[PDB]
């Protein structure tokens, strides 16, 4: 809908902005941590194997 | 109705700014996902 | 980093412990300096500036902003001057320092020793709304919800005599706490008795701090429904001074 | 030197012994008869600890250790080179602590305040006497008390705890641990709340106690109050120390096995002991 | 025989205080009530509580963590309510074994532990945000948030940072009454008598000091309640005889004293120190030092 | 049909907050359950399929 | 019976916006489930 | 009997609905967890056996 | 009435609530039929 | 009917609902913990599930 | 009446309560009979 | 107080009945589940 | 305005903030390019 | 274009301090992660390349 | 930017200078210690090897 702007009529922008920032940061950190803990998607390990760094 | 005291015009302006920011963020995320899929697909 | 030393046997644990020692030294300095905002500079027995002032310097002044526009600079000359007693009825017992000062007259009436009071600001303590914090219960809608109601009980002093009856209670409205009992003496005068220095029995209120003769000279409140901080300090000092005197 | 408000409080009276014989100050320190005794006992104990360091042959402050007489000595007064020095130091420490408490009582009487501080200190004195006197004598020897050393008494704590398996399973011990943790938590909260009321956001006026009550009611739905929080902190600390003392009193005197094994009466109640499944079969 | 002011002799009560508005949305506050049993030592009012977003997130995810542990216990009991009560303190939700490292483990082999841990972390972060924002909306100084951050630091070192540095979730403590005590004892045994960890000793010193300082401060305040000493803020801005008598007691006792405001700085730092030093001590164990008694022998406070 | 009257009993603020929290919790729970099942862990499936490590 | 202090038309408008959002969310979920079923059926 | 509606004359709809939602979610999650804890009725395990997943 | 609702307000509330409950129950019945066909538990 | 003159039905209904739910859950758990009356176990035995 | 409810209100509340109780008990009896047929415990 | 009397009586009745039932269940001789299993050969 | 700042003050602050951010991001991009040339991680 | 209005929403001082703290922590974390990985430990790479020790 | 000076209109110079000094000293000490822990860049070890001190 084009009437989604009315969300700012229900909630204060500062509250929502802080909540969204915290949520996005936590989600990004969690996904990066999950990928790093998996050896098949740890990009440092993949780079080491591909380029023969060690 | 209004719980925050903002007028409808102010709400529309704030939403326009927020949607511009959200569109930029989502576009960057989509580009990153395309790059990851090309480099190392997970499906 | 197990066994990895920067030099000799100095490893990450050694660096952490030495850094903690430095931080603790600084923290102790900071905490001691923050606690020197009252009572300084030091004086001698004659009230003159003491030649020794300690190793810790007095910190730079800090300002407290009050709700009524008044500014308090706690480490300042004005703050010390406002809380300084004058014309104390005291006398040195020795030329040397470190000896007690002898009360010249009546210590309880003169307000020295355990009866000492501090000249606090002569205004009532207020809440966040500006209302007086301590008010008699007749001016409120509070009711006794537990314990023993002392209103109407006789008041017995430390010499086993009846000096009057309790007529009202004074309550801290924001905290919902009884702080004073109002007593009508046999002479018709009304006094305020701190709650923390009396006992409520099943049939009487016992005040062991003072005797019957001293009840008549308890400091008074200017207004029947308002008690100021200075009046509170004077009453508490007078009542607490009875244990020694 | 004197504080700017100190002169009107330095009045005679309030002593327990000696009248005005010792009713004076040395610098900031009020002396009194019990202050004289405190200085004597403390100096003697410190110098005897240094002498015990000399006999031990080490000057490292973290290696100095004075040990009590061996368990085989019983309750006898031991030779100074065979544990008697520990007994003398223990007597000096007890005298110093009691004299400190009585000096605090005198200072309270002079200033016209309550005796909550000396009572609370007497609680810690009772704990100390439990560790060095009551329990060793109930076990029949001075050799069960802890030594006077910065880390050797930690070794004593470790050995005493492992005498009964894992000491975590002592119930009074669990209660004392919970009370100590609660005391630390409450101290943190009280300091933080008072400082946040006294130091508000820049540009704001000083907050009232109403602000503190509102804050703690908003955060968790209850506020104990300033008087309430002070009472609660004092009671928490006193109960923590008392129940720690009880936990050490019951260990080795009426209970000698593993506390983890003590915890099995609930499991071994016959109406569900044989029921197969779960952890304990 | 005198009144010691440990319990109120009489209770009074009117309408409950609903709190100052300031910058707080009063729509998020619940109703209030009274509980006379709590009025003997403190306040009888079970006042309104703020709901908001952070509180809702914290409550939901904390309940999720609690119920995850509970359903794991019920699974370990085999649906038997009698086994559930018989072995309640013996049930344990253990972390994944060391073979899986930091990767997601199967449900039966630590996945449930990881799910509960994530729920707990979300709840704790939300509650910290709640503490900070409730301080902010009333115009207060955020001291509570920084004090909470030290405990959060110790908690996250135990469960997150040290497991990451050690390369496996297996080194984290389990969710259980008796099991985490066993974990504590085994940690001490594995790292060579944690008594000889210097930061462990500092943390113990701070804990003992917190108990000692709260005893001192509570006894001092109750001793000067004759002069309204518990009204600490007013004493800070308008010094009375209670503050002076407390300061003089401690100055005559030990030669130095505090102020009505700075004693709380002492208190907050003493209480913060136990968790602040404990986190460092735990983080150093296994990553830098694996045998604290040998380390003490090397560094001159254990016999050789 | 007449379900809009829900907004006559419940304020949107509380309802929206609760719904957002519930959706986040449910999505996280389902994703974690699937990740802890190796047969449905898409990272493990991709590793096996594309020959990673 | 308005506890929220909302009129009938305000409630209808809010419900319309909420239903648009809910429909979008449910459509995305349906597409995701269809894709997962095609890629890796669980029945 | 059509008189059941009178429950709304004695119970507050807001609290009743909140409690009902919480109770229904907890019950549904509990039943799903009970089914999952049983290998015979774990639909993921059944699918793995059926399609030969690893 | 403790809640202060009118009798007609209560009737309308009950009507909409029962419509929603009927939808929920019908969906649950269909789900149970599908499960019974796919994997019966009796 | 006179019981509603004594007890507030709101508290009574809340307590009764909680009590009934807890009792039903307890009985179902007791039956589930008994393999003889565990209906899922009987179902997997009868239908030959894995 | 401590609750403030009149005699008529108490009577009608009891009538609704007993109708609901009778429905609940009938469902319970049917479930018990079905269980007894399927897997008797006596 | 009739209210407290009835509440305490109900709580006590429930606790007593549950206690007796748990005692009987704990005893295999009077555990009706085991008896029924043996009688009907559920095993 | 929640912060109480003006349009002009906010824009003047934002210009300086964006200048600093652009400088920081340019330096970071150069560093990443240099690292990729030296020790590529892809 | 109109994102400057963010400074009409949040106080610049707190935002600046928090952003600086966050950036420093992130940079230190990434550098430590690279150091803890021997493949990207630049000192180890240097000592292998130049034949130190 | 030619308008960076306005940072001093936002933050107190004294606090900024003190924090910067502490931060720079800690960073320099940390980097020096990191170099000392690596024998390939420990200049004292290199000097000992070159001059044959030990
Ligand atoms: C309570 C149960 C155990 C016990 C278990 C532990 C454990 C476990 C630990 C300590 C620790 C310490 N213990 Mg011990 N300790 C006991 C009995 C004592 C007694 C005593 C006479 O009762 C004393 C004085 C000490 C003293 C000490 C300190 C050296 C240290 C920090 C305490 C602290 O800050 O407390 C709070 C008090 C303050 C903050 C105020 C200042 C007190 C100062 C620091 C005391 C210094 C004493 C000095 C070294 C020697 C005194 C004699 C001299 C002649 C003056 N222990 C008994 C036997 N103790 C910790 C440590 O680091 O050990 C190496 C530690 O890990
Ligand atoms: C045999 C066992 C070992 C030993 C092993 C350990 C280990 C291992 C550890 C300690 C730790 C501690 N030990 Mg030790 N310890 C021993 C002997 C002692 C002795 C003694 C003999 O007298 C003492 C006094 C202590 C004292 C202490 C504390 C000083 C220290 C930190 C306590 C704390 O705050 O914990 C508990 C506080 C927390 C965990 C903080 C929690 C913060 C979070 C955010 C709050 C809870 C989360 C959430 C809200 C929960 C739900 C609440 C809902 C309302 C239901 N140990 C011996 C030598 N000890 C810790 C430490 O720091 O060591 C350096 C630690 O990890
Ligand atoms: C509620 C109980 C808590 C508490 C309370 C408490 N302690 C108190 C007080 C209170 C209320 C005081 O008023 C009093 C005081 O003045 O504090 C400033 C005191 C005090 N608590 C102290 C310490 C202390 N309290 C501790 C504990 C606690 N005290 C409890 C947790 C600990 C612990 C756990 O280790 C310590 C170290 C002192 C700072 C002080 C008492 C000072 C005193 O007694 O002074 C006179 C004595 C001397 C100056 C030195 C005497 C030295 C001896 C003669 C020789 C040494 C003997 C000793 C046995 C050697 C030990 C070696 C160690 C390695 C074992
Ligand atoms: C300085 C260090 C000390 C300290 C400090 C400290 N802790 C703090 C604070 C501070 C300064 C806070 O501001 C914060 C606070 O809000 O305190 C009131 C907190 C706090 N410290 C807490 C606990 C705590 N602190 C501890 C320790 C300490 N905290 C240290 C001693 C410990 C210990 C010793 O282990 C504990 C357990 C909390 C009371 C609180 C943080 C609250 C929090 O994080 O909440 C989020 C977590 C949850 C919601 C988890 C779930 C809770 C329930 C189990 C949910 C499930 C039940 C459901 C609601 C009901 C079910 C009913 C039936 C269906 C069963
Ligand atoms: C709100 O109110 C309050 C105050 O005021 C405003 C206060 O200050 C305090 C006190 C707290 C003060 C700073 C904060 C911190 C205090 C302590 C942390 C505990 C640490 C104490 C450590 C060692 C002990 C310090 C002194 C010890 C024993 C005393 C050592 C001094 C002397 C031994 C020598 C004794 C001399 C005696 C008589 C005189 C000898 C001379 C002669 C002839 C004999 C509290 C609690 C309070 O709540
Ligand atoms: C090892 C632990 C024991 C440390 C040695 C004994 C400590 C007591 C020594 C000082 C006691 C004394 O004699 O008091 C007088 C002296 C000077 O006081 P004063 O002149 O008033 O200072 C300000 C004037 N410029 O006193 C002073 O110097 C004032 C400064 C106080 C001394 C700091 C001692 C620290 C006390 C706490 C010990 C633990 C610290 C833990 C704190 C953690 C954070 C809260
Ligand atoms: C050991 C030898 C001592 C023999 C001296 C015997 C005299 C009795 C002690 C005494 O008189 O203390 C008073 C002392 C001086 O201060 P006061 O006299 O009060 O006034 C002078 C200020 N202009 O008041 C004092 O507080 C002395 C000043 C102390 C200076 C540093 C002390 C550090 C070591 C203290 C012991 C630990
Ligand atoms: C284990 O479980 C896993 C992790 C696998 C499951 C993962 C799950 C989830 C839960 C993924 C995400 C769900 C969501 C909901 C993701 C986010 C969707 C959103 C809503 C992204 C929002 C992006 C919005 C962004 C950056 C904000 C753009 C706003 C930018 C500045 C703010 C502009 C608004 C302004 C400035 C105020 C100025 C105007 C005035 C009038 C003052
Ligand atoms: C281990 O033990 C096990 C789990 C095996 C057995 C235990 C079992 C149980 C306890 C099973 C269940 C017992 C119950 C009680 C199940 C639930 C039955 C119910 C009561 C379902 C209710 C469904 C109600 C639903 C969806 C709500 C329909 C209401 C919908 C929106 C709300 C409409 C009302 C409105 C909107 C307010 C607006 C209207 C106006 C006029 C303003
Ligand atoms: C362990 O158990 C498992 C997990 C296996 C199975 C258990 C499963 C369950 C219990 C799954 C789910 C049950 C539910 C109930 C899932 C959720 C269903 C819902 C109710 C989804 C709702 C999505 C709602 C969405 C997107 C709507 C968000 C609404 C909006 C954008 C509309 C905003 C309206 C506004 C802004 C302002 C208008 C104001 C005016 C004045 C017009
Ligand atoms: C485990 O997960 C890993 C670590 C793998 C991945 C996680 C990753 C993330 C989450 C990385 C980063 C996300 C972000 C959000 C990075 C940072 C983006 C930003 C926004 C960086 C901002 C740099 C801003 C900079 C330099 C600007 C500082 C501002 C200044 C110099 C301007 C000064 C402002 C004002 C001076 C004074 C003017 C005053 C007046 C009155 C005009
Ligand atoms: C009938 O009863 C029911 C079923 C209703 C509920 C009964 C429930 C019970 C019995 C609940 C709990 C009993 C216990 C024993 C709860 C826990 C007690 C403890 C002692 C919890 C201790 C946690 C202790 C420590 C260190 C944990 C710190 C945890 C952390 C930092 C969290 C780590 C966060 C995240 C690891 C990892 C994220 C990474 C991924 C890959 C998700
Ligand atoms: Fe305090």
């Amino acid at each position: 809908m084009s009437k989604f702007y009315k969300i700012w009529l229900v909630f204060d922008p500062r509250r929502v902005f802080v909540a969204q920032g915290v949520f996005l940061f936590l989600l990004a950190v969690l996904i990066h941590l999950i990928l790093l803990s998996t050896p098949a998607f740890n990009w440092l390990t993949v780079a080491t194997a591909k380029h023969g760094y060690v | 109705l209004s719980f925050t005291g903002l007028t409808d015009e102010q709400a529309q302006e704030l939403h326009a700014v927020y949607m511009s920011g959200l569109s930029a963020f989502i576009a960057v995320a989509v580009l990153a996902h395309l790059a990851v899929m090309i480099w190392r697909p997970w499906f | 980093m197990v066994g990895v030393n920067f030099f000799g046997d100095f490893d990450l644990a050694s660096l952490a412990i030495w850094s903690f020692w430095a931080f603790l030294a600084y923290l102790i300095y900071y905490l001691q300096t923050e606690n020197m905002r009252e009572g300084y500079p030091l004086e001698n027995d004659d009230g003159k500036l003491s030649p020794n002032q300690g190793p810790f310097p007095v910190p730079s002044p800090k300002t407290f902003d009050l709700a009524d526009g008044r500014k308090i600079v706690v480490p300042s000359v004005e703050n010390e001057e406002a809380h300084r007693r004058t014309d104390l009825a005291l006398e040195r017992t020795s030329v040397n320092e470190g000896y007690p000062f002898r009360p010249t007259g009546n210590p309880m009436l003169d307000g020295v020793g355990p009866a000492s009071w501090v000249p606090r600001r002569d205004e009532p303590e207020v809440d966040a709304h500006g209302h007086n914090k301590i008010q008699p219960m007749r001016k409120t809608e509070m009711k006794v919800s537990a314990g023993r109601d002392p209103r109407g009980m006789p008041v017995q002093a430390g010499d086993t005599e009846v000096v009057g009856k309790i007529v009202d209670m004074w309550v801290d409205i924001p905290e919902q706490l009884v702080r004073y009992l109002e007593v009508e003496l046999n002479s018709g005068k009304k006094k305020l008795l701190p709650m923390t220095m009396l006992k409520i029995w099943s049939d009487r209120v016992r005040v062991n701090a003072i005797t019957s003769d001293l009840f008549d000279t308890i400091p008074d409140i200017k207004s029947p429904d308002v008690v100021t901080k200075l009046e509170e300090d004077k009453i508490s000092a007078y009542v607490a001074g009875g244990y020694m005197y | 030197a004197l504080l700017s408000f100190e002169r009107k409080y330095r009045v005679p009276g309030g002593t327990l012994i000696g009248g005005s014989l010792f009713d004076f100050w040395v610098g900031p320190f009020y002396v009194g008869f019990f202050g004289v005794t405190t200085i004597f006992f403390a100096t003697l104990g410190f110098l005897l600890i240094l002498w015990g360091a000399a006999m031990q042959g080490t000057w490292n402050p973290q290696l100095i250790s004075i040990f009590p007489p061996p368990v085989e000595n019983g309750l006898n007064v031991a030779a100074l080179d065979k544990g008697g020095l520990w007994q003398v130091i223990t007597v000096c420490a007890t005298g110093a602590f009691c004299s400190w408490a009585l000096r605090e009582v005198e200072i309270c009487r002079k200033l016209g305040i309550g005796f909550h501080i000396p009572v609370a200190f007497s609680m810690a004195i009772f704990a100390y006497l439990t560790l060095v006197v009551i329990r060793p004598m109930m076990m029949g020897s001075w050799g069960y008390a802890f030594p006077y050393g910065i880390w050797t008494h930690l070794d004593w704590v470790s050995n005493t705890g492992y005498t009964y398996g894992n000491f975590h399973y002592n119930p009074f011990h669990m209660l004392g641990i919970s009370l100590f943790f609660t005391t630390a938590w409450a101290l943190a909260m009280h300091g933080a709340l008072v400082l946040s009321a006294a130091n508000p956001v820049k540009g704001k006026t000083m907050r009232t106690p109403d602000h503190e009550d509102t804050y703690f009611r908003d955060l968790m739905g209850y506020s104990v109050g300033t008087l309430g929080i002070h009472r609660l902190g004092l009671l928490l600390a006193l109960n923590a120390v008392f129940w720690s003392a009880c936990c050490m009193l019951v260990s080795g005197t009426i209970y000698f096995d593993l506390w983890s094994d003590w915890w099995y009466w609930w499991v071994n109640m016959p109406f569900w002991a044989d029921m197969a499944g779960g952890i304990n079969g | 025989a005198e009144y010691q002011n440990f319990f109120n002799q009489v209770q009074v009560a009117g309408a409950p205080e609903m709190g100052l508005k300031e910058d707080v949305d009063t729509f998020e506050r619940t109703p209030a009530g009274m509980f006379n049993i709590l009025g003997w030592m403190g306040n009888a009012q079970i006042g309104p509580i703020y709901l908001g977003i952070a509180g809702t997130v914290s409550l939901a995810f904390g309940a999720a963590w609690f119920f995850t542990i509970g359903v794991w216990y019920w699974y370990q009991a085999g649906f038997d309510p009698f086994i559930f009560m018989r072995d309640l303190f013996f049930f344990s939700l253990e972390p994944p074994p060391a073979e899986y490292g930091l990767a997601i483990a199967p449900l039966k082999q630590g996945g449930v532990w990881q799910i509960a841990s994530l729920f707990m972390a979300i709840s704790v972060i939300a509650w910290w945000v709640r503490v900070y924002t409730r301080a902010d909306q009333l115009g207060m100084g955020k001291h509570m948030a920084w004090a909470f951050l030290s405990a959060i630091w110790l908690w996250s070192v135990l469960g997150f940072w040290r497991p990451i540095l050690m390369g496996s979730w297996s080194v984290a403590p389990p969710y259980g009454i008796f099991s985490h005590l066993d974990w504590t004892n085994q940690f001490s045994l594995d790292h060579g008598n944690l008594f000889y960890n210097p930061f462990h000793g500092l943390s113990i010193a701070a804990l003992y000091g917190s108990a000692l300082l709260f005893a001192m401060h509570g006894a001092t305040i109750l001793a000067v309640t004759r002069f309204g000493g518990e009204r600490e803020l007013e004493q800070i801005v308008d010094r009375g005889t209670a503050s002076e008598r407390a300061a003089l007691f401690w100055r005559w006792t030990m030669g130095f004293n505090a102020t009505m405001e700075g004693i709380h700085r002492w208190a907050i730092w003493m209480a913060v120190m136990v968790t602040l030093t404990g986190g460092i001590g735990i983080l150093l164990s296994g990553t830098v030092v694996d045998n604290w008694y040998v380390w003490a022998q090397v560094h001159g406070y254990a016999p050789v």
Side-chain angles (χ1 to χ4, degrees), chain C residues 52 97, chain D residues 26-27:
Chain C
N52 54 281
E97 317 287 328
Chain D
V26 170

Side-chain angles (χ1 to χ4, degrees), chain D residues 29-31 100 103, chain E residues 217 220 246-247 250 254 256-259 263:
Chain D
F29 303 96
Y30 179 77
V31 177
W100 194 266
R103 178 171 169 263
Chain E
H217 182 62
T220 306
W250 285 112
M254 63 183 179
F256 70 105
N257 59 274
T259 54
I263 184 59

Side-chain angles (χ1 to χ4, degrees), chain C residues 45-234:
Chain C
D45 289 9
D46 260 359
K48 298 294 140 293
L49 206 62
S50 180
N52 54 281
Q53 291 294 331
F56 293 88
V58 182
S60 58
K62 192 186 64 174
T63 301
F64 285 91
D65 299 354
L66 269 57
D68 50 9
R70 257 136 45 181
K71 302 283 206 55
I72 277 75
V73 179
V74 23
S76 58
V77 178
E78 290 80 357
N79 185 260
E80 295 277 72
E81 168 66 28
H83 294 83
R84 162 162 257 101
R85 288 283 299 280
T86 57
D87 300 357
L88 289 176
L90 292 169
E91 159 195 317
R92 300 187 61 173
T93 60
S94 179
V95 182
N96 300 270
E97 317 287 328
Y99 277 88
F101 302 86
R102 187 190 65 91
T104 65
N106 195 342
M108 289 188 55
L109 265 52
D110 296 336
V112 300
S116 304
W117 53 270
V118 175
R120 310 183 73 191
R121 290 187 287 269
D122 205 316
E123 67 235 21
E125 185 172 350
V126 299
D127 57 5
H129 313 87
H131 309 131
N132 293 341
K133 163 188 274 291
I134 306 177
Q135 303 180 26
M137 250 187 62
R138 61 179 172 269
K139 262 253 170 296
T140 68
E141 273 285 280
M142 291 198 177
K143 302 212 285 292
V144 174
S145 55
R148 350 203 186 192
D149 188 10
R151 293 173 294 182
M153 287 186 178
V155 180
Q156 191 172 67
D159 50 0
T160 319
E161 281 281 295
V162 172
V163 304
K165 55 211 177 61
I166 299 296
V167 292
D168 199 5
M169 307 198 295
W170 289 57
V171 175
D172 191 321
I173 300 180
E175 280 275 329
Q176 291 195 353
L177 201 69
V178 184
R179 296 200 182 276
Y180 301 101
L181 293 189
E182 190 164 355
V183 52
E184 171 146 350
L185 300 179
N186 300 329
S187 62
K189 298 155 77 167
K190 300 208 187 4
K191 301 292 182 175
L192 258 52
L193 308 177
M195 176 54 68
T196 50
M197 279 180 295
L198 52 79
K199 214 79 190 71
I200 300 180
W201 295 2
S202 59
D203 54 330
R204 85 190 75 173
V205 177
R206 169 63 80 96
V207 182
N208 286 322
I210 52 179
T211 60
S212 295
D213 45 313
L214 298 176
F215 265 88
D216 305 315
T217 46
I218 300 181
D220 282 318
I221 53 181
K222 302 169 91 171
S223 189
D225 297 329
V226 181
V227 55
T228 64
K229 283 170 290 186
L230 180 54
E231 293 164 356
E232 287 188 278
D233 221 60
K234 289 185 179 181

Side-chain angles (χ1 to χ4, degrees), chain C residues 24 27-28 31-32 36 40 53-56, chain D residues 29, chain E residues 251 254-256 266 269-270 273:
Chain C
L24 183 60
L27 182 64
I28 290 177
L31 289 180
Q32 180 56 37
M36 296 181 55
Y40 290 86
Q53 291 294 331
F56 293 88
Chain D
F29 303 96
Chain E
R251 187 175 191 86
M254 63 183 179
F256 70 105
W266 281 98
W269 272 108
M270 177 75 70
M273 271 306 193

